Design an enzyme around this catalytic site. Structure first.
Site, mmCIF file in Angstrom:
data_model
loop_
_atom_site.group_PDB
_atom_site.id
_atom_site.type_symbol
_atom_site.label_atom_id
_atom_site.label_comp_id
_atom_site.label_asym_id
_atom_site.label_seq_id
_atom_site.Cartn_x
_atom_site.Cartn_y
_atom_site.Cartn_z
ATOM 1 N N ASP A 1 0.825 -1.217 0.000
ATOM 2 C CA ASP A 1 0.000 0.000 0.000
ATOM 3 C C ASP A 1 0.855 1.261 0.000
ATOM 4 O O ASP A 1 0.400 2.319 0.440
ATOM 5 C CB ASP A 1 -0.935 0.009 1.194
ATOM 6 C CG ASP A 1 -2.051 1.001 1.070
ATOM 7 O OD1 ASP A 1 -2.467 1.462 -0.004
ATOM 8 O OD2 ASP A 1 -2.579 1.363 2.176
ATOM 9 N N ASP B 1 -3.336 -3.080 -2.400
ATOM 10 C CA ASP B 1 -4.365 -2.061 -2.494
ATOM 11 C C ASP B 1 -4.250 -1.271 -3.793
ATOM 12 O O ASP B 1 -3.192 -1.187 -4.418
ATOM 13 C CB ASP B 1 -4.224 -1.077 -1.319
ATOM 14 C CG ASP B 1 -5.480 -0.175 -1.120
ATOM 15 O OD1 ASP B 1 -6.539 -0.616 -1.563
ATOM 16 O OD2 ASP B 1 -5.341 0.935 -0.500
HETATM 17 O O1 LIG Z 1 -0.722 7.159 -3.161
HETATM 18 C C1 LIG Z 1 -1.290 6.366 -2.384
HETATM 19 N N1 LIG Z 1 -0.534 5.621 -1.554
HETATM 20 C C2 LIG Z 1 0.906 5.876 -1.436
HETATM 21 C C3 LIG Z 1 1.278 5.545 -0.046
HETATM 22 C C4 LIG Z 1 2.180 6.177 0.654
HETATM 23 C C5 LIG Z 1 2.516 5.792 2.057
HETATM 24 O O2 LIG Z 1 3.578 4.796 2.071
HETATM 25 C C6 LIG Z 1 4.785 5.442 2.506
HETATM 26 N N2 LIG Z 1 5.823 4.976 1.609
HETATM 27 C C7 LIG Z 1 5.921 5.208 0.238
HETATM 28 N N3 LIG Z 1 6.897 4.524 -0.299
HETATM 29 C C8 LIG Z 1 7.444 3.792 0.723
HETATM 30 C C9 LIG Z 1 8.485 2.861 0.806
HETATM 31 N N4 LIG Z 1 9.288 2.467 -0.259
HETATM 32 C C10 LIG Z 1 9.230 3.056 -1.598
HETATM 33 C C11 LIG Z 1 9.832 4.444 -1.628
HETATM 34 O O3 LIG Z 1 11.240 4.374 -1.583
HETATM 35 N N5 LIG Z 1 8.771 2.296 1.965
HETATM 36 C C12 LIG Z 1 8.067 2.649 3.074
HETATM 37 N N6 LIG Z 1 7.082 3.527 3.082
HETATM 38 C C13 LIG Z 1 6.812 4.070 1.909
HETATM 39 C C14 LIG Z 1 4.496 6.931 2.396
HETATM 40 O O4 LIG Z 1 5.402 7.652 3.236
HETATM 41 C C15 LIG Z 1 3.023 7.001 2.814
HETATM 42 O O5 LIG Z 1 2.784 6.840 4.198
HETATM 43 C C16 LIG Z 1 -2.726 6.188 -2.411
HETATM 44 C C17 LIG Z 1 -3.454 7.086 -3.137
HETATM 45 C C18 LIG Z 1 -4.876 7.033 -3.211
HETATM 46 C C19 LIG Z 1 -5.603 8.032 -3.981
HETATM 47 C C20 LIG Z 1 -6.749 7.679 -4.716
HETATM 48 C C21 LIG Z 1 -7.452 8.644 -5.423
HETATM 49 C C22 LIG Z 1 -6.937 9.909 -5.447
HETATM 50 F F1 LIG Z 1 -7.676 10.834 -6.135
HETATM 51 C C23 LIG Z 1 -5.815 10.312 -4.756
HETATM 52 C C24 LIG Z 1 -5.117 9.353 -4.031
HETATM 53 C C25 LIG Z 1 -5.552 6.051 -2.523
HETATM 54 C C26 LIG Z 1 -4.832 5.080 -1.752
HETATM 55 O O6 LIG Z 1 -5.404 4.131 -1.098
HETATM 56 C C27 LIG Z 1 -3.387 5.125 -1.698
HETATM 57 O O7 LIG Z 1 -2.799 4.183 -1.059
HETATM 58 CL CL LIG Z 2 -4.203 2.461 5.753
HETATM 59 MG MG LIG Z 3 -4.113 2.577 -0.563
#
Ligand SMILES: O=C(NC/C=C/[C@H]1O[C@@H](n2cnc3c(NCCO)ncnc32)[C@H](O)[C@@H]1O)c1cc(-c2ccc(F)cc2)cc(O)c1O
Ligand SMILES: [Cl-]
Ligand SMILES: [Mg+2]
Ligand SMILES: [Cl-]
EC number: 2.1.1.6
Length: 213
Positions: free
Chosen positions: A139, A167
């Site tokens: 996710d 997800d």
């Molecule tokens: O973008 C979404 N998720 C991203 C998650 C980010 C989280 O994960 C953390 N994260 C990222 N890469 C890594 C990584 N490793 C990789 C990086 O080096 N290692 C560890 N942690 C990591 C971030 O710091 C955040 O906490 C999303 C968007 C929509 C959405 C739908 C409709 C819309 F219109 C807008 C948005 C709906 C959803 O359910 C979604 O999950």
């Molecule tokens: Cl969540």
């Molecule tokens: Mg998500």
């Protein structure tokens, strides 16, 4: 302050400590009534709950904790002694997640690792004494689902039967991951159609069970 901080503060102001359901309900209410946030949500959350209960995993890895919603969802259904590891690269969000789990009373079941998956995954065997994972919840950034799946395999962390649950395979979508797992003999896939958190927009989860090399 930030939305995440505002979500935590609403949970603290309103929810009950040690009651994971009350925590999930508070977050759902805040995100429905006040400010949307990218938690997995209740529609998809119910599907995750059904998967968790079916497979009864002893060791789960989550990539991308965010505010800890899915960690609370999963950890509350783990059998005694079972554990969740969750990776969150944003230090602010890692702290929110730890405090969310603390409030829910789930801290003994969960380890929140503050770092990027690509850096932490290679440390799980030696540093965190992991053998293989029973389940992985993906996710985090959508373009990292495939690279991290391939890294998990390289590192020897998947076993025949490891359940991957992803997800957002519709929105925002993860097209390389989804094409890859659906086309690979090493995965058996099932699609669970649902709705984007807090929205009347179709989304879904993909379950991909690893078949070995
Ligand atoms: O973008 C979404 N998720 C991203 C998650 C980010 C989280 O994960 C953390 N994260 C990222 N890469 C890594 C990584 N490793 C990789 C990086 O080096 N290692 C560890 N942690 C990591 C971030 O710091 C955040 O906490 C999303 C968007 C929509 C959405 C739908 C409709 C819309 F219109 C807008 C948005 C709906 C959803 O359910 C979604 O999950
Ligand atoms: Cl969540
Ligand atoms: Mg998500
Ligand atoms: Cl929802």
């Amino acid at each position: 302050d930030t939305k995440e901080q505002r979500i935590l503060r609403y949970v603290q102001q309103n929810a009950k400590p040690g009651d994971p359901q009350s925590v999930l309900e508070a977050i759902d209410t805040y995100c429905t009534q006040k400010e949307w946030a990218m938690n997995v949500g209740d529609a998809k959350g119910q599907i995750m709950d059904a998967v968790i209960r079916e497979y009864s995993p002893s060791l789960v890895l989550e990539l991308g904790a965010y505010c800890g919603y899915s960690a609370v969802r999963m950890a509350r259904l783990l059998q005694p002694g079972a554990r969740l590891l969750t990776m969150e690269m944003n230090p602010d969000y890692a702290a929110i997640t730890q405090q969310m789990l603390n409030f829910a009373g789930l801290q003994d079941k969960v380890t929140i690792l503050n770092g990027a998956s690509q850096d932490l995954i290679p440390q799980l065997k030696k540093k965190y004494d992991v053998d293989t994972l029973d389940m992985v919840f993906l996710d985090h950034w959508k373009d990292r689902y495939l690279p991290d799946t391939l890294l998990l395999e390289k590192c020897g962390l998947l076993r025949k039967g490891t359940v991957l649950l992803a997800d957002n395979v519709i929105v925002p979508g993860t097209p390389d991951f989804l094409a890859y797992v659906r086309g690979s003999s090493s995965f058996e896939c099932t699609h669970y159609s649902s709705y984007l958190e807090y929205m009347k927009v179709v989304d879904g989860l993909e379950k991909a069970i690893y078949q070995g090399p």
